[PDB]
Amino acid sequence: AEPRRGDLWLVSLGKHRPAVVVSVDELLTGIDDELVVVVPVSSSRSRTPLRPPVAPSEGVAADSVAVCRGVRAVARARLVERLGALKPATMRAIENALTLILGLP
Amino acid sequence: MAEPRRGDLWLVSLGKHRPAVVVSVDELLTGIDDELVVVVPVSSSRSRTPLRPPVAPSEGVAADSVAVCRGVRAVARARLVERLGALKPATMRAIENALTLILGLP
């Protein structure tokens, strides 16, 4: 459990694709089977209020968007390597989109 | 089949099967099968914790069942194969709180 919230990580599924860690750091115990919640990042989908943009300086090879509607818990073991970290503004956009999607106060 | 609604409890295919709570909002649904619905899986083999609030048989599941909010995930609508029930509003508020913690939301 080297992933951190706000990090951008390469995820297994054979394909590897990037995703942003959104679960909080104090959940991690360092075992492979534990669940980490990530938001997939795609460079082939257009930008919307629920798909905020992610820049190459944050770890992707090309202009990407965070598909917050595709949020999912994956096993630690599926996180293959660290790619970068997101700017705090991008994290606030993802938090807002996610607040909308899940109907939270 | 019916359109899933927030707070509904649905059976999810993956062949294994498991109940889950719909947590995404209703205005995201456009009526196509491939569109993503965010659910919280329900388990009867995990103990209760502040992140695994209990779900009562009156809400559609077996006794001693918990909402594994840490297992939240988007699945295709088509994987929601049978409507099972609905949650009491207090249980939905517990799940909202747990999700707010897990995802670090304001």
Side-chain angles (χ1 to χ4, degrees), chain A, chain B residues 1-33 35-63 65-87 89-106:
Chain A
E2 157 74 6
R4 281 175 168 274
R5 195 168 177 278
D7 279 357
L8 185 72
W9 277 71
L10 198 66
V11 180
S12 243
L13 270 18
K15 299 180 187 290
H16 293 350
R17 288 298 178 265
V20 178
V21 179
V22 297
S23 38
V24 296
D25 289 340
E26 66 264 37
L27 298 163
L28 303 165
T29 62
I31 68 189
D32 278 333
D33 56 286
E34 79 188 330
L35 295 181
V36 182
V37 183
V38 303
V39 166
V41 168
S42 169
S43 59
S44 70
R45 302 189 64 181
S46 58
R47 157 185 202 257
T48 69
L50 293 186
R51 306 201 292 264
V54 180
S57 79
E58 299 168 291
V60 284
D63 282 334
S64 289
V65 297
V67 187
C68 297
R69 200 180 159 165
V71 59
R72 60 190 46 178
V74 297
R76 165 73 182 86
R78 291 183 57 194
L79 269 52
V80 153
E81 47 197 44
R82 185 183 179 283
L83 296 178
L86 298 195
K87 282 123 56 169
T90 308
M91 283 306 295
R92 285 184 302 261
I94 285 167
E95 282 161 0
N96 296 335
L98 215 60
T99 294
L100 287 180
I101 288 152
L102 305 166
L104 292 174
Chain B
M1 193 138 67
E3 202 64 13
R5 285 173 102 92
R6 197 166 178 276
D8 277 355
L9 186 99
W10 281 74
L11 194 68
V12 182
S13 184
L14 272 274
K16 311 312 104 172
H17 299 268
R18 152 208 305 286
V21 176
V22 179
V23 294
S24 40
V25 296
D26 292 340
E27 64 266 36
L28 299 164
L29 305 165
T30 61
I32 69 189
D33 279 89
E35 76 186 334
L36 294 179
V37 181
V38 186
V39 300
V40 167
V42 169
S43 170
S44 57
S45 71
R46 304 276 293 276
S47 59
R48 162 199 320 198
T49 71
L51 294 188
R52 303 201 291 263
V55 184
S58 84
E59 303 168 290
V61 283
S65 286
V66 296
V68 183
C69 298
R70 199 177 158 165
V72 57
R73 60 188 189 112
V75 298
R77 162 76 183 83
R79 290 188 170 288
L80 270 51
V81 298
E82 165 194 20
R83 186 182 180 283
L84 296 176
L87 297 192
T91 306
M92 280 305 297
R93 283 167 12 219
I95 285 167
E96 283 163 359
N97 297 337
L99 288 170
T100 294
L101 291 185
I102 288 153
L103 305 166
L105 292 175

